[PDB]
Structure 1
Amino acid sequence: QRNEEKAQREANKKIEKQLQKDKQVYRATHRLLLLGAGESGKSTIVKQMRILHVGIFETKFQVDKVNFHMFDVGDERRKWIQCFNDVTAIIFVVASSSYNMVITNRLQEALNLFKSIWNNRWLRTISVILFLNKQDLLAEKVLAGKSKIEDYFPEFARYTTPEDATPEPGEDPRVTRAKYFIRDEFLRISTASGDGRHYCYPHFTCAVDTENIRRVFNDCRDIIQRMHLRQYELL
């Protein structure tokens, strides 16, 4: 009779009240995705990020009272990538000191993967944060004269350092040329398309660098600010 319906409405109110509390946490958190080729250093960045601030691999950390949630999904023909169309940013890790290794060249495989990711039907809004990992190996490779980049890449012969290229403190002129060559090689694909909806942020990363989390925080803040500015047509 009507006695049963009286208790049924009580169950709805308890559940509906609980959903309100869970909405606040969900709306006040940021999700990130880790991508990259194998043997690049994805887990190495995770270990440093996890320890300092606290199937599938997930990580929770907090910076400046802001909730952050990072997950790693770790195989061509990716069908599951359509789910990650609402994340704040995509973190791309590439080993820049592996141009001479074949498994074609590993760097060329990374470029192909990045180009495939950039021009995707679902990822037409999500920005990309790019980490050029393993810098000291590349510096050591360039410092000694052997296995020149021109041998594996022919465009390196007709490349010169850009005018607005800030050198590293005390770095030799040879390593900077190769570093910025690789950086613009990745940036060309990003600037070739996009229509201003998403941008790419490059960085130079090592295994011992500790300022990575600050870079991620600043880039996320800039991404959100630019999204709001574009929405208000104030850019």
Structure 2
Amino acid sequence: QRNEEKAQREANKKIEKQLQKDKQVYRATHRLLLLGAGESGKSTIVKQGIFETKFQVDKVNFHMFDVGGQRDERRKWIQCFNDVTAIIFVVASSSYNMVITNRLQEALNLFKSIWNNRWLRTISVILFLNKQDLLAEKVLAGKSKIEDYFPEFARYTTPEDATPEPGEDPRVTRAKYFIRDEFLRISTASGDGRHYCYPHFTCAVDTENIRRVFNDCRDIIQRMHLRQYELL
């Protein structure tokens, strides 16, 4: 009676003291969700049920989730990831001709479905446009033209404020920027400043992807704070 009540309070205090230590670790970690189009080469990106990985850059802890145990066209489980910092979307940009409705259109439909969601209404997306060397190799050779698959490409011009590389043939730059604009117009169509999209061009020999993720997360948090304080 009298002794039993004191015993319960003793165990509660020890547990509540442990929960304070766990709260410090929980609040200092950033969670990321990794998605793919099915054959986008996202395993190479992470190489260099649910699968979890941990990494640290500049004394900041990141923790990324990859889902491979569930494969369906109705993502009922996606409402759990409404508190993550950002979503990483990996798409193969060199699969316009491949049909096995081509794969770029399916990837665009998936991106459009994810963007306009009731739960992911305040979450930014980091977009990786993988397989650039394959795209350049396919574009440079003839008999394979995006016009035969994307009729809108017949009236596209490379933007004046573009950033071509040193040795690129100007043919490939137009295709790259067309593919990027396809995602960008969907991103900006329904955006009200609550979240943005950060597209990048990625290859197989790239090694600075973790720096890109770090900088994009920093920008995401800074923009969130600026919008919160009515400064943006």
Aligned residues: 228
For the residues of structure 1 that align with 2:147 and 2:47, how far apart are their CA atoms? Answer: 35
For the residues of structure 1 that align with 2:51 and 2:204, how far apart are their CA atoms? Answer: 20
1:156, 1:181 within 8 Å by CA — same for their partners in 2?
yes
For the residues of structure 2 that align with 1:63 and 1:129, how far apart are their CA atoms? Answer: 18
For the residues of structure 1 that align with 2:143 and 2:92, how far apart are their CA atoms? Answer: 19
Secondary structure in structure 1 of the residue aligned to 2:165: coil
Structure 1 range deviating more: 86-95 or 1-10? 1-10
For the residues of structure 2 that align with 1:135 and 1:77, how far apart are their CA atoms? Answer: 30
Shift of 1:119: 0.3
Shift of 1:104: 1.2
1:142, 1:174 within 8 Å by CA — same for their partners in 2?
yes
Structure 2: 5+ residue runs without aligned partners? none
For the residues of structure 2 that align with 1:207 and 1:72, how far apart are their CA atoms? Answer: 20
Secondary structure in structure 1 of the residue aligned to 2:112: helix
Shift of 1:204: 0.2
Shift of 1:216: 0.4
Match status 1:14 vs 2:14: yes
TM-score of the superposed pair, with normalisation by structure 1 = 0.96
1:99, 1:105 within 8 Å by CA — same for their partners in 2?
yes
Structure 1 range deviating more: 166-175 or 121-130? 166-175
Shift of 1:132: 0.1
1:56, 1:71 within 8 Å by CA — same for their partners in 2?
yes
Superposition CA RMSD, Å = 0.6
* CA-to-aligned-CA distance 1:3-39 (integer Å, 9 cap, x gap): 1111111100000000000000000000000012101
Shift of 1:207: 1.3
1:42, 1:93 within 8 Å by CA — same for their partners in 2?
yes
For the residues of structure 2 that align with 1:207 and 1:57, how far apart are their CA atoms? Answer: 22
Corresponding residue of 1:71: 65
For the residues of structure 2 that align with 1:144 and 1:103, how far apart are their CA atoms? Answer: 22
TM-score of the superposed pair, with normalisation by structure 2 = 0.97
For the residues of structure 1 that align with 2:139 and 2:43, how far apart are their CA atoms? Answer: 26
* CA-to-aligned-CA distance 1:184-230 (integer Å, 9 cap, x gap): 11100001012110000010001110010000000000000000000
Runs of 4+ deviating beyond 3 Å: none
Shift of 1:44: 1.1
Corresponding residue of 2:35: 35
* CA-to-aligned-CA distance 1:69-91 (integer Å, 9 cap, x gap): 00111x10110000000000000
Shift of 1:161: 0.4
Corresponding residue of 1:58: 52
Corresponding residue of 1:51: none
Secondary structure in structure 1 of the residue aligned to 2:47: helix
Match status 1:96 vs 2:90: no
Among 170, 178, 182, the alignment partner of 1:185 is 182
* CA-to-aligned-CA distance 1:39-97 (integer Å, 9 cap, x gap): 1011111111xxxxxx1011000000000000111x10110000000000000000000
* CA-to-aligned-CA distance 1:111-158 (integer Å, 9 cap, x gap): 000000000000000000000000000000011112111001101110
For the residues of structure 1 that align with 2:167 and 2:10, how far apart are their CA atoms? Answer: 71
1:124, 1:194 within 8 Å by CA — same for their partners in 2?
no
Map of 1:38-49 to 2, 5 A cutoff?
38-48=38-48
For the residues of structure 2 that align with 1:224 and 1:110, how far apart are their CA atoms? Answer: 27
For the residues of structure 2 that align with 1:118 and 1:112, how far apart are their CA atoms? Answer: 10
Corresponding residue of 1:206: 203
Shift of 1:103: 2.2
For the residues of structure 2 that align with 1:186 and 1:93, how far apart are their CA atoms? Answer: 12
Secondary structure in structure 2 of the residue aligned to 1:176: helix
Among 113, 129, 147, the alignment partner of 2:126 is 129
Secondary structure in structure 2 of the residue aligned to 1:186: helix
